[PDB]
Ligand binder design. Structure first.
Ligand SMILES: Nc1ncnc2c1ncn2[C@@H]1O[C@H](COP(=O)(O)OP(=O)(O)OP(=O)(O)O)[C@@H](O)[C@H]1O
Ligand SMILES: Nc1ncnc2c1ncn2[C@@H]1O[C@H](COP(=O)(O)OP(=O)(O)OP(=O)(O)O)[C@@H](O)[C@H]1O
Ligand SMILES: Nc1ncnc2c1ncn2[C@@H]1O[C@H](COP(=O)(O)OP(=O)(O)OP(=O)(O)O)[C@@H](O)[C@H]1O
Ligand SMILES: [Mg+2]
Ligand SMILES: [Mg+2]
Lengths: 506, 148, 74, 59
């Protein structure tokens, strides 16, 4: 590894990619953010992962929370710090004032602390140190310059001791100064900012490595989530364009379509079905999910527009018994309102469920529904995330898009995901003789030949029946064509008079 | 109630932001849905004739069945049409039927089979030789069958 | 924030009524609504025909049109 | 025909039945005179009609 600085892994998911390896050893990293942003969790996870994966003992310095509380709280993530304190791998050093105290003591204590922490480090043979909320200590009665000196003293002694430290700080503004006294920013070797941004009543947490003296790293904000497993970060820009590509085909669950697609979809491919409301994107999804079961493969249908009940009533009315797929343990249905979360969360729930069920096929009914509210750039980012995961995982994916205007839609997608997609299936209403018929079209396919016709198709209980193209029509896409005739009556089987039987016999 | 109807969600969207509105819709929508209450909601499109999207606020998605009403200019006159745009579990008719309104209420007549561009509000009437082919004067190939 | 556990994030609208604080966790509502095949009439028979035998009892129906088209009649 | 004529329409009326024709009308000193609809026209509403002048059934 060509980086001039030796780093230590945090094992926090995604952090080591962002930091190009982990935290520089022997130095201290300021981690700051507003209230509830995950500071304490980050620093705990840093010591914890350090002990459980490298048998690197840790010293945790707390100025406000209580050692019982830090232990109580870590149970949230299923971590038994008490056991580690016991085995002597972790030492929480209580520096919190007394709920029955005086006034005055923030610098000789800053010496008392230095001397203290050196004892603990030395005694436990510690390699990692986390100081939780140094801020609160001079929050006794101090001004910027006093803070800069004291911090510097601490960081400095720590570097001498040889310890790799994480120091936590508070901020009041999500985009204002880095930390309270507008002085910690420059005194630390590395700076990490945890943000919990509002924006539209939803909250989005992001982590940023602002600086790392000595090495490179990923720049900017990265969305993360706090779960039962702690911090989880997605470096969506760290995802590489090295997904495996096969020529293998798979069925769509509709034979005629398969023909149209020159032999079915590619296993390794992202398929997109768009059309106005009512055109039947949901039917195709149903049929694509069912097909992976009839072939004893696992598939997940993430539904964001219909209930699990409704999905079933409707599916059964189209043939296909979703009930069975469920039992046979071949099909898994999810279901969730796009509003019941932020994109980051959603993205993780999807990933999560793909790991626990190892599907071969996945279907997102209505990306366009997940786009409700969110900004286009946040949405596109979500699409590249789910799309790319699927791709590198050899999982075939069918995504749905409802277009905002039926008939006359001038772009495949309103969000411009066109390009992020391999195969595009297009559904549309055609006004033919005072009636609304449907048409299906394989708009594009990357490695195949696919049919160029805009075939009309009907929906029955049997499902989708793909008929013929509207050859004697112009202005098809417009949604209400013009009929023109060089013919129509031309053969195909003219031979008049009594051509039929009726119900009795034939 | 067993049934609920909201006359003009589109009037409730007055002022409010689209995201606050969508949130309201999902609100009254899902409550009704989980409560086994059939609900009929109303939406007045901002433009008569030529409306390119079912709803301006994009609720169409969060709905099971869509009934669409539209003016059709026929011979210097303003007539109505009704169309069952979509229905999730059923088959529904695909015709854009004309309909009148009287004291008796709504009478749903026939489709405008001999027109083009109806969706638009101003069709193009178009028989100019109806489906019996330019062979209405049936050639005269039939100048033999009858004799003396 | 709630140190130690989880919770829903973000803002949730609420109303102060005669029954005190009432909060609607609109993002906490689940996509588990019951779905039947039972039909019901529209009040218009011909309509019922067009809809393949009436509206589903379990359903959200939407009537759109220009002003004056007759949504209010339906 | 290269002229700007007017038309009036009772677009809607809540309790009554009203006429659905788009009637041509002129303005004089006498006031408004409401004549007939443009029966033999298309896309009236649009403002720029197209008279049909259908060659009937053409026999
Ligand atoms: N199991 C869990 N699953 C999901 N979120 C959790 C879980 N446990 C805790 N959280 C969340 O993580 C947060 C904890 O924040 P944390 O204690 O890490 O420090 P902080 O916010 O940085 O600083 P402060 O000491 O000011 O609160 C809580 O606000 C809560 O939202
Ligand atoms: N059993 C049935 N028989 C005939 N046609 C039906 C049947 N069930 C559904 N359909 C038709 O299919 C349509 C349902 O559309 P579908 O569920 O496939 O999803 P969509 O059009 O892609 O998306 P959305 O339903 O959210 O608008 C109905 O509007 C209707 O015309
Ligand atoms: N007794 C009646 N006889 C014939 N037509 C009537 C009668 N009453 C009303 N109408 C017609 O029906 C229309 C009334 O529309 P309606 O009250 O159903 O609601 P809408 O069109 O959905 O919404 P809005 O009235 O706000 O525009 C009138 O514009 C008119 O053409
Ligand atoms: Mg759907
Ligand atoms: Mg009204």
């Amino acid at each position: 590894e060509h980086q001039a600085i030796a780093k230590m892994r945090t094992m926090i998911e995604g952090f080591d990619d962002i930091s190009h390896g982990g935290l520089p050893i022997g130095r201290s990293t300021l981690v700051s953010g507003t209230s509830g942003t995950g500071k304490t969790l980050f620093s705990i996870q840093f010591l914890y992962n350090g002990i459980i994966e490298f048998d690197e003992p840790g010293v945790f310095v707390t100025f406000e929370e209580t050692p019982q509380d830090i232990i109580k709280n870590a149970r949230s993530f299923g971590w038994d710090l008490a056991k580690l304190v016991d085995e002597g791998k972790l030492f929480i050093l209580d520096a919190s004032p007394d709920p029955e105290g005086q006034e005055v003591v923030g610098g000789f204590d800053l010496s008392a602390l230095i001397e203290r922490i050196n004892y603990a480090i030395q005694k436990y043979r510690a390699r990692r140190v986390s100081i939780d909320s140094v801020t609160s200590v001079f929050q006794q009665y101090d001004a910027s310059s006093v803070v800069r000196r004291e911090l510097f003293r601490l960081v400095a002694r720590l570097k001498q001791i040889g310890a790799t430290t994480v120091m936590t700080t508070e901020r009041i503004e999500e985009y204002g100064p880095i930390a309270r006294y507008g002085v910690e920013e420059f005194v630390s070797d590395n700076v990490v900012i945890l943000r919990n941004v509002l924006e539209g009543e939803r909250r989005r947490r992001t982590l940023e490595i602002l600086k790392l003296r000595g090495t490179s790293h990923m720049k900017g904000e990265y969305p993360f989530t706090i779960t039962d497993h702690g911090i989880n970060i997605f470096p969506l820009g760290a995802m590489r364009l090295t997904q495996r590509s096969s020529n293998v085909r798979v069925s769509s669950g509709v034979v005629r379509l398969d023909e149209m697609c020159g032999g079915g979809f590619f296993k390794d491919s992202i398929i997109l079905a768009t059309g106005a409301t009512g055109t039947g994107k949901t039917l195709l999804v149903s049929r694509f999910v069912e097909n992976a079961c009839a072939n004893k493969e696992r598939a997940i249908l993430f539904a964001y527009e219909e209930s699990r009940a409704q999905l079933l009533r409707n599916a059964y009315s189209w043939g296909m018994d979703f009930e069975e797929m469920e039992r046979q343990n071949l099909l898994k249905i999810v279901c969730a309102y796009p509003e019941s979360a932020g994109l980051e969360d959603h993205l993780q729930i999807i990933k999560s469920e793909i790991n626990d069920f190892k599907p071969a096929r996945i279907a997102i009914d209505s990306l366009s529904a997940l786009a409700r509210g969110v900004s286009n750039n946040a949405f596109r980012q979500f699409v590249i995330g789910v799309t790319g995961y699927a791709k590198q995982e050899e999982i075939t994916g069918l995504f749905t898009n409802t277009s905002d205007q039926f008939m006359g839609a001038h772009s495949i997608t309103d969000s411009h995901i066109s390009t992020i997609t391999d195969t595009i299936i297009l559904l549309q209403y055609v006004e033919i003789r005072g009636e609304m018929s449907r048409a299906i079209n394989v708009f594009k396919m990357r490695g195949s030949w696919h049919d160029k016709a805009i075939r009309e198709f009907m929906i029955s209980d049997k499902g989708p029946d793909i008929k013929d193209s509207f050859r004697n029509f112009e202005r098809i896409i417009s949604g209400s064509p013009t009929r023109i005739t060089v013919d129509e009556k031309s053969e195909l089987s003219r031979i008049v008079r009594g051509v039929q039987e009726k119900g009795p016999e034939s």
